[PDB]
Amino acid sequence: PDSVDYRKKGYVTPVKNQGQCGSCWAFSSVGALEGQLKKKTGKLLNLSPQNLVDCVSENDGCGGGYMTNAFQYVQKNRGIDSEDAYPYVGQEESCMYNPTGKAAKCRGYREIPEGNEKALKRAVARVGPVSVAIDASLTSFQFYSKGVYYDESCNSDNLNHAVLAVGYGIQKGNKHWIIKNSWGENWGNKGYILMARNKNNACGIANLASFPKM
Numbered sequence: 001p002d003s004v005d006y007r008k009k010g011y012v013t014p015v016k017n018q019g020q021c022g023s024c025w026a027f028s029s030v031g032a033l034e035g036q037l038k039k040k041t042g043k044l045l046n047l048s049p050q051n052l053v054d055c056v057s058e059n060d061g062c063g064g065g066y067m068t069n070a071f072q073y074v075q076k077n078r079g080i081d082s083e084d085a086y087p088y089v090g091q092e093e094s095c096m097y098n099p100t101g102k103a104a105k106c107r108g109y110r111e112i113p114e115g116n117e118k119a120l121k122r123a124v125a126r127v128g129p130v131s132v133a134i135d136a137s138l139t140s141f142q143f144y145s146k147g148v149y150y151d152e153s154c155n156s157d158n159l160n161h162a163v164l165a166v167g168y169g170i171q172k173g174n175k176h177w178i179i180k181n182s183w184g185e186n187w188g189n190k191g192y193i194l195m196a197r198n199k200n201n202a203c204g205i206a207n208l209a210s211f212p213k214m
């Protein structure tokens with residue numbers, strides 16, 4: 001497909017805010033799951049980022065983590081709670097079990113061929129929102145406000161932030177990836193940022209992408 005924007009089909013929930021917690025990966029993971037859930041059931045709702053922060057032991061909660069492990073967890077645990085049944089508190093707590101909390105399930109996940117933007121594009125068009133990792137350490141990124149973001153000093157080999165690709169397209173001749181962050185709706189462009197697509201895998205956008213099976 002030439003251009004995709006899952007927000008137009010109602011596959012994306014509102015922009016969240018990590019608070020005082022480095023739980024970007026939990027947010028990235030739920031966003032993908034929320035997508036497969038909308039596609040599968042027709043229901044659009046917030047999943048529990050906290051459920052993952054607290055239970056994905058392979059990870060390190062507020063200290064950071066990886067999306068794959070989160071997907072592996074939801075599959076092994078036979079489910080993930082919703083935001084309502086397992087609200088976000090912004091810090092790591094003991095893993096809670098909500099008898100009525102299950103709101104989605106995961107039967108695995110797939111990875112995108114490392115550094116392949118073309119494969120990332122095909123995956124977004126056919127699957128839905130995809131979880132991707134990038135280098136967000138540049139002041140240029142942290143202070144992004146508008147336009148298609150590109151900074152040559154971005155480090156493809158310095159993955160330190162997890163986000164969500166809800167689509168892709170082109171703006172003013174510049175191809176981009178539609179990216180949902182989790183620093184609240186006041187960061188970037190209403191919690192969003194258009195990142196350079198096909199610019200030598202800028203910021204390593206396609207170096208660690210994955211989506212959940214549902």
Ligand SMILES: *C(=O)[C@H](CCCC)NC(=O)[C@H](CC(C)C)NC(=O)OCc1ccc(Br)cc1
Binds near residue numbers: 025067
């Ligand atoms: C995003 O908010 C966080 C910021 C963590 C620094 C405060 N970044 C991550 O969680 C990254 C996710 C991308 C690299 C995909 N993961 C990460 O930092 O891994 C660190 C880590 C430490 C210990 C364990 Br156990 C697992 C992972």
